Amino acid sequence: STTEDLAKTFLEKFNYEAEELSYQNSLASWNYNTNITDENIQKMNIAGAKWSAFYEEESQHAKTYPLEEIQDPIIKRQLRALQQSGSSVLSADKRERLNTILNAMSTIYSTGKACNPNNPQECLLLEPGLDDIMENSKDYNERLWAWEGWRSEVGKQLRPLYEEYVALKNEMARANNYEDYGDYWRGDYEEEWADGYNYSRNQLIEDVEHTFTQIKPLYEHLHAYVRAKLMDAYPSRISPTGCLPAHLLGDMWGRFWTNLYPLMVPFGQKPNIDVTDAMVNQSWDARRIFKEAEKFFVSVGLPNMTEGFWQNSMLTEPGDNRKVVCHPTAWDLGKHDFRIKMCTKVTMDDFLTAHHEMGHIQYDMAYAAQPFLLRNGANEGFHEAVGEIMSLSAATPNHLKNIGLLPPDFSEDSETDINFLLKQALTIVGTLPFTYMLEKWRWMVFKGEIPKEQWMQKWWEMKRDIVGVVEPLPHDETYCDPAALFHVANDYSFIRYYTRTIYQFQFQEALCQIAKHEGPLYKCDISNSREAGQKLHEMLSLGRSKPWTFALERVVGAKTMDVRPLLNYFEPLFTWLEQNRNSFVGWNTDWSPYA
Amino acid sequence: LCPFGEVFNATRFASVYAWNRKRISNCVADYSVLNSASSTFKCYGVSPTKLNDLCFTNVYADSFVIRGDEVRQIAPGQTGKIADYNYKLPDDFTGCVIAWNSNNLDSKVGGNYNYLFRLFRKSNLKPFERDISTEIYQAGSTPCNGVEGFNCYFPLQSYGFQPTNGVGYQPYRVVVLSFELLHAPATVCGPK
């Protein structure tokens, strides 16, 4: 009469049951994704409904065991994972209302769009049209028109259902013994153990704030330089010590600053490195680039790929009548089966995407030895961090030289190296503060610190005070700008990135300090270095059995996040930035196109 | 002169708990090479080349199928669900185990669930014992009244073989060549 043994046999049956059902569902999903049909979407719908009902029933059945009298770490963790349940406490009426509200979001967000009032006839869908306008537009009035039109067409329809959804979710979260929905979302990091391994909920926000406070000045400096370069790009148009307008960031929301690269090259005579010419000249293909990537992966000390990978993965378009989707993605079906689906071009960008996907799949086989409930990463950002560390490792001039795609007579151009580092820095350091801003706003809204009539006011105030980006026109509370992004519209957490960069820099520094590198941390190549791979193998194969704080230590040397590798990597750019000696520090953010 | 053709080219294989057993005599095994795709040969009292210098009285040539991970468990003094509840051998086992992959012949696209193996048993199984009875297994104090679930589970469980899964889940047929030497007259000959 031991609940330990009862839960043990429960999990023993649930393992095989869930494994078989999951493999069948994943196979159906892949078959749908390769070729699209009405029959395929019918299979998708029926399988999804069957899994929803089946998992709900299994969780309800498993909810009949206690948690205060379980001793074994692993059994306790499995019981917690199975007991954590949702969408079951609510009654039928409230559940149906919530489902209808979410479906209304998912429909009207994609359905709503704006067009030109000047020319009613000429306007296309959001996907090709507005994206092309934003990526190839250089007119103040045109960009302002597109931005204002979209932001006035989406929010006025997304506001009410979103408010009702947030109220209902807050009520449910309070009913489910959590503090609120924000508390539930924050509760994805806590770990319970002894010997000083406790992890509460406030630690995450504490460390995030501590990191941002000491990381902001580099963003200030790069913002000053980018503002000066943008002034060079466009004349007599923006305040000299003000902000960057939201419509001049290359895209609607300004998630990335990748489009500003041609407007900030210090030396036109010496452009950035472009080995794409030699890539096309050598006349290789997807098979060849993937063989080179596999060779690079093997050279570190990681094992070979599976035969079924090459046997079944599709890389070159057949060109027949049936259509497919050409968006590379990482597939992990389970049952020792791994597949990829991508359409390949010969550029550095596709080189990097192929390498990143290969790293993702490598992690996937790395933690695939655990039981079904443990076939998962330590946290959300581990996969992308593991991909990006080796992406940065393989994105260096010494590597692209030592694979012999560069002429022997070429000398190491520090200017080209600085160009590449400037590009990568302008992307990375500009990516994260917006993510931290939006996640803080979402958490505050969910927990309820922001009342109804203060949504947009608080959003804009936080935007200005954190990032330093101004708006060109006034707006009222009816608009719902922060939900314009797909992740916010479709209820996806945005904290998995800012975390991911910190882990990326920490792992890069730890892995490159051991390969007996002579120069600075950057440019380090881990090729022909067995000990780094041996150290990283336990990190890759640990899985989720151990807590992530315990796991990360075995490689890093510490069990808490730190941002020292970021600064030590970006120090050369800081030393370079003598160029901007006429740059003033600080801003007021009081000049806008309203006046 | 044996039905090695029949024992090696059997169209269907029984379940693990319902494993089959046969008796052979008056002939000799002459395996050349590589027929055990998974070069698996773990037998102790004899040698792979010296086996032709011996004769045997009793033979228990079993045949069944197992998934990829559990092929390691076919060894004396081994633990795991298969070992404790389905098939056990004593510490003095004398027989050479043959195993090979037959994914091209024993897998279908629609999914195969015709193979079963017992998962629950009250006590550790005795060597060379088969429990084909489908009696219900109980786990609690209060008695179930013919309705399953709630601390009374059905023992058996399916395999679920597919053609696209990896090697670690690919089905292999397994043959155990039991032999023993006693006062009984010689029944199996050699390459005389």
From Swiss-Prot, chain B:
Q: Report residue spans for region: Receptor-binding motif.
A: 101-172
Instruction: Explain what the record says happens when changing K81N.
Output: In strain: Beta/B.1.351, Omicron/BA.1, Omicron/BA.2, Omicron/BA.2.12.1, Omicron/BA.2.75, Omicron/BA.4, Omicron/BA.5, Omicron/BQ.1.1, Omicron/XBB.1.5, Omicron/EG.5.1; May enhance affinity to human ACE2 receptor
What is known to happen upon mutating R12K? In strain: Mu/B.1.621
Q: What is the effect of changing G160S?
A: In strain: Omicron/BA.1
Region spans: Integrin-binding motif: 67-69
- Outcome when changing Q157Y: Reduced host ACE2-binding affinity in vitro
Region of interest called Receptor-binding domain (RBD), as start-end residue ranges on this chain: 1-192
Q: What is the effect of changing E148Q?
A: In strain: Kappa/B.1.617.1
Q: Which cysteines share a disulfide bond?
A: C2-C27, C43-C96, C55-C189, C144-C152
Phenotype upon changing R72S: In strain: Omicron/BA.2, Omicron/BA.2.12.1, Omicron/BA.2.75, Omicron/BA.4, Omicron/BA.5, Omicron/BQ.1.1, Omicron/XBB.1.5, Omicron/EG.5.1
Impact after mutating L116R: Increased resistance to neutralizing antibodies. Decreases HLA binding to NF9 epitope. Increased binding affinity to human ACE2
Report the outcome of N165Y.
Increased binding affinity to human ACE2
Q: Where is this region: Disordered?
A: 119-154
Q: What does the record say mutating N165T does?
A: In strain: 19B/501T
Q: Which superkingdom, per the lineage?
A: Viruses
Q: What is the effect of changing S36F?
A: In strain: Omicron/BA.2, Omicron/BA.2.12.1, Omicron/BA.2.75, Omicron/BA.4, Omicron/BA.5, Omicron/BQ.1.1, Omicron/XBB.1.5, Omicron/EG.5.1
How is the quaternary structure described?
Answer: Binds to host ACE2. RBD also interacts with the N-linked glycan on 'Asn-90' of ACE2. Cleavage of S generates a polybasic C-terminal sequence on S1 that binds to host Neuropilin-1 (NRP1) and Neuropilin-2 (NRP2) receptors. Interacts with host integrin alpha-5/beta-1 (ITGA5:ITGB1) and with ACE2 in complex with integrin alpha-5/beta-1 (ITGA5:ITGB1). May interact via cytoplasmic c-terminus with M protein. May interact (via N-terminus) with host bilirubin and biliverdin, thereby preventing antibody binding to the SARS-CoV-2 spike NTD via an allosteric mechanism.
Protein name (database record): Spike protein S1
Annotated organism of origin: Severe acute respiratory syndrome coronavirus 2 (2019-nCoV)
Gene giving rise to this polypeptide: S
